[PDB]
Symmetry: C2
């Protein structure tokens, strides 16, 4: 069926040591819809905490990802140790966009776009790489 | 002195000509977190309330405690122009922690530490500088149009 309106969805890319976090109530990137009157960035922090217990302290808006159902904004987030919570029953980690893992199509497509941005010669690509540098240092320090 | 410290979020937002401060003395934007609400959540809500800005990206810099409050301090990007809103009557820009402007004391303390961090050769300093570069690029494209 043709969706008549698009959800204002917020989606999180959370790099753990061995890959990007995905969850399953198919696996998908974590996140959810923003309510009327709230920003997708507000909704993302709320929903990542609900789904995994992670408390986001830093985020970088990366790009929009638009589908017939969803108008995503996609964010690289730094936060703890994830665990399945509430509606989430499993979590895993994805090492590349063509993982064997059974990913929701949109999730794979966003990961593909992420992998490209990571190597971009742009102010945004530099910010993303710097942030991943920070996450890597924090993890190493632990 | 209180039984406990209240959780506050505080934003450092760099506009082209300096860091945003607001007055309802000037202080860095921010406010108290509600029960159940992370400081990073409260930061987005409060900046919007006070300035109309919609934060897309933030970088946690450090904690700043005082006798009453425990602040988390964040460098934030939004791509609009701030404006006095609600209880905020006036806004201005600060170019250095030694500014002449009448800043709240803790507001000044936080800007001094931020000034140090901005120059630091650490992964955090590098992230901070890259985010600043992003904001600058955004502003350059805007001024271009």
């Amino acid at each position: 069926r043709l969706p008549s309106d698009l959800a204002r969805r917020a989606t999180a890319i959370i790099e753990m040591p061995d890959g990007v976090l995905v969850t399953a109530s198919r696996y998908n990137l974590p996140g959810g819809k923003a309510n009327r009157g709230e920003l997708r960035s507000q909704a993302l922090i709320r929903e990542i905490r609900e789904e995994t217990g992670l408390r986001i302290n830093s985020m970088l808006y990366l790009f929009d990802h638009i589908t017939p159902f969803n108008a995503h904004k996609v964010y690289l987030c730094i936060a703890g140790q994830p665990k399945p919570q509430n509606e989430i029953e499993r979590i895993a980690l994805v090492s590349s966009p063509d993982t064997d893992m059974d990913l929701f199509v949109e999730g794979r497509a966003i990961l593909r776009r992420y992998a490209r941005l990571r190597n971009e010669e742009t102010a945004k690509g530099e910010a993303l790489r710097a942030l991943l540098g920070l996450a890597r240092y924090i993890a190493k320090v632990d």
